[PDB]
Amino acid sequence: SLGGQLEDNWRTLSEVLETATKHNNHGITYIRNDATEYFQSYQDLYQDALVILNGLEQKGIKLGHKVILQIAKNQDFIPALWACFLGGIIPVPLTVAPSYDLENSAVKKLENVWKILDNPLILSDSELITEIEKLGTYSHLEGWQVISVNELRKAPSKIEQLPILDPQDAALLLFTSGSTGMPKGVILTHHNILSMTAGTVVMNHFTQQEVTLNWMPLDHVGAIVFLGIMAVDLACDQIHVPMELVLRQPLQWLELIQKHQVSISWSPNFAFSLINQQAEELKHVSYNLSSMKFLVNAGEQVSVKTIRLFLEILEKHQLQERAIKPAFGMTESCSGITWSAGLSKNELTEENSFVSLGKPIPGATIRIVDQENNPLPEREIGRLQIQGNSVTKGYYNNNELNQEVFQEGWFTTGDLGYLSKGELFITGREKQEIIINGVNYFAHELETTIEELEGVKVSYTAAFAVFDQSRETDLLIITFSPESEQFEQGIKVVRKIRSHVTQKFGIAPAYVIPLERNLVPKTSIGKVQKSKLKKDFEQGLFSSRIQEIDQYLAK
Numbered sequence: 001s002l003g004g005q006l007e008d009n010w011r012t013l014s015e016v017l018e019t020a021t022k023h024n025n026h027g028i029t030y031i032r033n034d035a036t037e038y039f040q041s042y043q044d045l046y047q048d049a050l051v052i053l054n055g056l057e058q059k060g061i062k063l064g065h066k067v068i069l070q071i072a073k074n075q076d077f078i079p080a081l082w083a084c085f086l087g088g089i090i091p092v093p094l095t096v097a098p099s100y101d102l103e104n105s106a107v108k109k110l111e112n113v114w115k116i117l118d119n120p121l122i123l124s125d126s127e128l129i130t131e132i133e134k135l136g137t138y139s140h141l142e143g144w145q146v147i148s149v150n151e152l153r154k155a156p157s158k159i160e161q162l163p164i165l166d167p168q169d170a171a172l173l174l175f176t177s178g179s180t181g182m183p184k185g186v187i188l189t190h191h192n193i194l195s196m197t198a199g200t201v202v203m204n205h206f207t208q209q210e211v212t213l214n215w216m217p218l219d220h221v222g223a224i225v226f227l228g229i230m231a232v233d234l235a236c237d238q239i240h241v242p243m244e245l246v247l248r249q250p251l252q253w254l255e256l257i258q259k260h261q262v263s264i265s266w267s268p269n270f271a272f273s274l275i276n277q278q279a280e281e282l283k284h285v286s287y288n289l290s291s292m293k294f295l296v297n298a299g300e301q302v303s304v305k306t307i308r309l310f311l312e313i314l315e316k317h318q319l320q321e322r323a324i325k326p327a328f329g330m331t332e333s334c335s336g337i338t339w340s341a342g343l344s345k346n347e348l349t350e351e352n353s354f355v356s357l358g359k360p361i362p363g364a365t366i367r368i369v370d371q372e373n374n375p376l377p378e379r380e381i382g383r384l385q386i387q388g389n390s391v392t393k394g395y396y397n398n399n400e401l402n403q404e405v406f407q408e409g410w411f412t413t414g415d416l417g418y419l420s421k422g423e424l425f426i427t428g429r430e431k432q433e434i435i436i437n438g439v440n441y442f443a444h445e446l447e448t449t450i451e452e453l454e455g456v457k458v459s460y461t462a463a464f465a466v467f468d469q470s471r472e473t474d475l476l477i478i479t480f481s482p483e484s485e486q487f488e489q490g491i492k493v494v495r496k497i498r499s500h501v502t503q504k505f506g507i508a509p510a511y512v513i514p515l516e517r518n519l520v521p522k523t524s525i526g527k528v529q530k531s532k533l534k535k536d537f538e539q540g541l542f543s544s545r546i547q548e549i550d551q552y553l554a555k
């Protein structure tokens with residue numbers, strides 16, 4: 001149903017980095033937690049990567065082998081990632097766990113992936129090395145080996161020549177958590193990654209003069225590719241900020257855009273809302289954001305009302321018209337695959353209620369089909385299917401999954417939406433629909449509406465529907481985290497949530513469950529995974545709290 005013509009490029013990642021070294025002008029600027037800065041030119045990165053690569057070789061890690069990445073320090077992660085790229089070693093970046101002595105999904109993912117990949121070596125930093133080894137000994141994991149990047153930097157560097165690689169060979173393996181069970185390992189070739197890069201650059205007119213800024217964790221595809229490898233491909237300046245720095249003080253994102261004259265940046269929808277929360281203090285200070293021309297809202301459903309408010313607040317801070325770029329992407333397509341032309345605030349009205357995520361990059365084709373795999377007419381909801389050189393060819397060691405989601409040269413994303421004049425509009429995700437009396441409801445709207453309320457902490461909210469067997473009816477369940485200091489003072493807001501939702505939508509939440517911030521399940525990028533919360537409810541993990549709240553009501 002779509003298009004885009006792109007000339008074949010047969011570069012590898014090593015050639016891309018080698019091309020970038022000539023521009024000793026540019027490279028990576030690392031922002032530390034204390035807001036100090038450290039510049040590493042592409043030449044320095046290349047030299048650093050070679051040293052680490054030699055360290056890897058000396059430990060017996062060979063071409064084609066896989067290594068797990070568990071590195072929180074950005075100054076260690078990127079050089080180690082590129083080290084693997086140059087040596088033909090496949091890096092497997094995984095989310096750094098919040099702790100390694102307590103039960104969490106990140107610890108489970110690390111152990112599961114480790115088992116799937118036949119006991120590969122784990123790369124860490126000096127801060128985390130001890131904790132990760134402890135987990136290995138405590139859980140008696142046979143062959144568990146962890147090494148710091150700084151120990152690999154010590155390797156007497158007997159550097160030999162770099163291997164010549166096939167761009168069709170695997171270069172990057174990224175595991176995503178599925179709805180249930182084992183994680184899914186997305187295989188990404190050089191050709192996959194560089195075909196996204198080329199398509200995105202040509203379509204959006206990026207040049208070596210760009211300044212990219214990332215504040216998402218480096219294990220995610222958006223940070224590795226769109227705001228990592230792309231910048232290397234362009235040989236432009238790239239900046240990496242730890243997520244917690246911007247979370248602790250959201251306005252620092254705006255400060256860094258101004259200070260570094262940033263032209264390209266990205267966050268999911270919730271972070272836009274976090275800025276909107278700062279509307280008051282944004283009246284007493286002024287930022288200059290005129291350098292920002294490509295501001296990506298991607299990673300989760302985009303809220304019309306949130307974007308509209310974001311423009312109104314920040315146009316008073318020199319944010320140019322059409323700078324905001326809602327986009328669609330996934331791990332399976334090396335992040336971004338469609339890009340908006342920009343928002344003009346005229347599509348944002350009590351409008352749609354769906355934001356356009358734009359047209360696909362050159363080389364890519366997208367379509368909306370029915371259950372029969374037949375293309376549907378424009379403007380009606382169906383399953384999104386994607387193809388092109390930027391799209392993955394298959395998952396790691398999972399034929400059952402490959403045969404299901406890869407058919408006729410198309411990949412089923414598991415996402416729902418429609419096409420209108422060539423532009424993609426995502427409406428929801430499969431098996432997460434909120435249907436009550438045949439009427440379609442949309443989680444993001446509900447969540448946005450909830451998050452307007454005082455006492456509801458932004459980015460910890462979820463809305464989903466379960467079927468109640470006893471009463472033979474569908475229930476709307478709302479989970480949130482209180483903005484109180486602290487819970488359980490967030491009992492007053494439970495009542496406030498139910499009424500506010502009824503007033504605006506005409507339907508009510510059956511249950512409203514407050515949650516401790518640390519227990520709301522989130523992907524590395526901060527997207528609330530509603531599947532894990534649905535399961536938790538059906539156990540039920542919250543039954544005690546539900547009763548306790550119900551006992552507090554009726555008094």
Ligand SMILES: Nc1ncnc2c1ncn2[C@@H]1O[C@H](COP(=O)(O)OC(=O)[C@@H](N)Cc2ccccc2)[C@@H](O)[C@H]1O
Pocket residue numbers: 176221222226266296297298299300301302326327328329330331332335336337357413415426429523525
């Ligand atoms: N703009 C969007 N609107 C609605 N849902 C989205 C959007 N972007 C991503 N998603 C959801 O997130 C899923 C992919 O999740 P992950 O594999 O964890 O990686 C991601 O979250 C990528 N979407 C990140 C990205 C995209 C574009 C540019 C930069 C960065 C998609 O299948 C879709 O369900």
